[PDB]
Design a protein around this motif. Structure first.
Motif, PDB file in Angstrom:
ATOM      1  N   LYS A   1      84.018  66.265 -52.588  1.00  8.62           N
ATOM      2  CA  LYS A   1      82.724  65.401 -52.484  1.00  8.62           C
ATOM      3  C   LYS A   1      82.210  65.358 -51.316  1.00  8.62           C
ATOM      4  CE  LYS A   1      84.558  61.061 -52.350  1.00  8.62           C
ATOM      5  NZ  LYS A   1      84.379  61.267 -50.801  1.00  8.62           N
ATOM      6  N   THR A   2      80.773  65.022 -51.041  1.00  7.68           N
ATOM      7  CA  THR A   2      80.163  64.503 -49.932  1.00  7.68           C
ATOM      8  C   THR A   2      79.199  63.804 -50.258  1.00  7.68           C
ATOM      9  OG1 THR A   2      79.482  65.329 -47.738  1.00  7.68           O
ATOM     10  CG2 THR A   2      78.439  66.454 -49.614  1.00  7.68           C
ATOM     11  N   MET A   3      78.805  62.778 -49.124  1.00  8.15           N
ATOM     12  CA  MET A   3      77.817  61.642 -49.449  1.00  8.15           C
ATOM     13  C   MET A   3      76.476  62.348 -49.031  1.00  8.15           C
ATOM     14  SD  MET A   3      79.651  59.852 -50.927  1.00  8.15           S
ATOM     15  CE  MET A   3      78.684  58.231 -51.052  1.00  8.15           C
ATOM     16  N   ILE A   4      75.364  62.004 -49.770  1.00  7.13           N
ATOM     17  CA  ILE A   4      74.052  62.493 -49.416  1.00  7.13           C
ATOM     18  C   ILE A   4      72.924  61.449 -49.747  1.00  7.13           C
ATOM     19  CG2 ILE A   4      74.492  64.842 -50.007  1.00  7.13           C
ATOM     20  CD1 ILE A   4      73.511  64.438 -52.486  1.00  7.13           C
TER      21      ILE A   4
ATOM     22  N   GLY B   1      68.888  55.940 -52.748  1.00  4.17           N
ATOM     23  CA  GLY B   1      69.863  55.591 -51.942  1.00  4.17           C
ATOM     24  C   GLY B   1      71.042  56.660 -51.804  1.00  4.17           C
ATOM     25  N   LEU B   2      72.239  56.105 -51.209  1.00  4.73           N
ATOM     26  CA  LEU B   2      73.532  57.064 -51.053  1.00  4.73           C
ATOM     27  C   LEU B   2      74.110  57.395 -52.257  1.00  4.73           C
ATOM     28  CD1 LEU B   2      74.835  58.366 -48.454  1.00  4.73           C
ATOM     29  CD2 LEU B   2      76.512  56.500 -48.503  1.00  4.73           C
TER      30      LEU B   2
ATOM     31  N   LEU C   1      80.633  69.012 -54.494  1.00  3.52           N
ATOM     32  CA  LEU C   1      80.681  70.364 -53.940  1.00  3.52           C
ATOM     33  C   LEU C   1      81.649  71.533 -54.955  1.00  3.52           C
ATOM     34  CD1 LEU C   1      81.363  69.672 -50.209  1.00  3.52           C
ATOM     35  CD2 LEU C   1      79.191  70.502 -51.501  1.00  3.52           C
ATOM     36  N   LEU C   2      81.028  72.406 -55.083  1.00  6.43           N
ATOM     37  CA  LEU C   2      81.601  73.557 -56.076  1.00  6.43           C
ATOM     38  C   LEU C   2      81.389  74.982 -55.174  1.00  6.43           C
ATOM     39  CD1 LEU C   2      79.648  72.619 -59.454  1.00  6.43           C
ATOM     40  CD2 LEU C   2      82.197  72.116 -58.573  1.00  6.43           C
ATOM     41  N   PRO C   3      82.395  75.943 -55.536  1.00  8.07           N
ATOM     42  CA  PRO C   3      82.382  77.123 -54.562  1.00  8.07           C
ATOM     43  C   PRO C   3      80.954  77.842 -54.289  1.00  8.07           C
ATOM     44  CG  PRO C   3      84.031  77.180 -55.944  1.00  8.07           C
ATOM     45  CD  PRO C   3      83.330  76.083 -56.654  1.00  8.07           C
ATOM     46  N   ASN C   4      79.751  77.483 -55.209  1.00  3.76           N
ATOM     47  CA  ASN C   4      78.735  77.978 -54.730  1.00  3.76           C
ATOM     48  C   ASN C   4      77.792  77.159 -54.207  1.00  3.76           C
ATOM     49  OD1 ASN C   4      78.237  76.122 -56.801  1.00  3.76           O
ATOM     50  ND2 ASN C   4      76.860  77.408 -58.038  1.00  3.76           N
TER      51      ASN C   4
END
Length: 241
Positions: A136-139, A144-145, A150-153
């Motif tokens: 995962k990553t925060m965006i 809000g945040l 994340l997946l391979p694509n």
């Protein structure tokens, strides 16, 4: 002190259905064993109550029938793979599981029969997930945040998977990770997985080729790839040539 992988051989009633959504209940059951006041675990796992460098698979069924709600085990057998770069954790946990002798996952009660020792492969080529990879990553969004899965694509997946493994290597060994690896995704399917009473994430069931430094790949093999390893995510197995 080296890594260790075991296959727990489980037995429930013939013809039992293991629900498709069992992973969440399995993770809860494993957590509850590790943190149990039962003396079978308490003395053995006193030093591992916050230990997060291990992984485990989904329940695997060999003699199977596909059903609406899950996978039926015709002979009642199921297999749970558990591994860690810390062999003392695995040995202590296995001794506790064998002494206890029972594991309940949701509404299914298993007897814990034996723990089969699985030596590490001497070479890696093709790996496939036996529990899916979470990354995962925060965006920042207009709401809000938020957490992005994340997946391979996703363009960030590749380096984020590598950097997660290298950071975990340094966190576990308290030594610099002067190693590298690369991979090629051969196939992937997204899977929706419950991780909290109300949070569902997208994880990757995937098959991939690897190359690079054996010791780093071996660490991913026994610790898991991706995040939330200790909640049962990211465990892989070698695929025979």
């Amino acid at each position: 002190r080296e890594s260790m992988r075991i296959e727990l051989e489980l037995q429930t009633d013939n013809f039992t259905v293991i629900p498709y959504n069992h992973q969440y209940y399995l993770a809860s059951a494993i957590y509850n064993k590790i943190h149990s006041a039962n003396p079978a675990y308490a003395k053995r796992l006193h030093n591992y109550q916050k230990f997060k460098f291990f992984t485990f698979s989904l329940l695997q069924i060999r003699k199977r029938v596909i059903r609406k709600e899950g996978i039926e085990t015709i002979d009642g057998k199921a297999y749970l793979y558990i591994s860690s770069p810390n062999n003392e954790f695995i040995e202590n946990f296995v001794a506790g599981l064998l002494e206890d002798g029972k594991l309940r996952v949701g509404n299914v009660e298993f007897f814990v029969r034996k723990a089969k020792i699985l030596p590490i492969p001497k070479k890696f080529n093709i790996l496939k997930t036996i529990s899916p990879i979470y990354l995962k990553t925060m965006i920042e969004t207009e709401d809000g945040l938020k957490t992005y899965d994340l997946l391979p694509n996703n363009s960030k997946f590749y380096e984020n998977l590598k950097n997660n493994l290298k950071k975990k290597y340094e966190a576990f060994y308290n030594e610099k990770c002067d190693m590298n690896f690369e991979f090629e995704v051969l196939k992937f399917r997204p899977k929706r997985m419950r991780i909290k009473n109300d949070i569902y994430c997208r994880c990757s069931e995937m098959v991939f080729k690897v190359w690079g430094d054996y010791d780093l790949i071996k660490f991913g093999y026994e610790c898991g790839f991706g995040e939330k390893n200790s909640m049962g995510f990211g465990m892989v197995v070698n695929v025979e040539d």
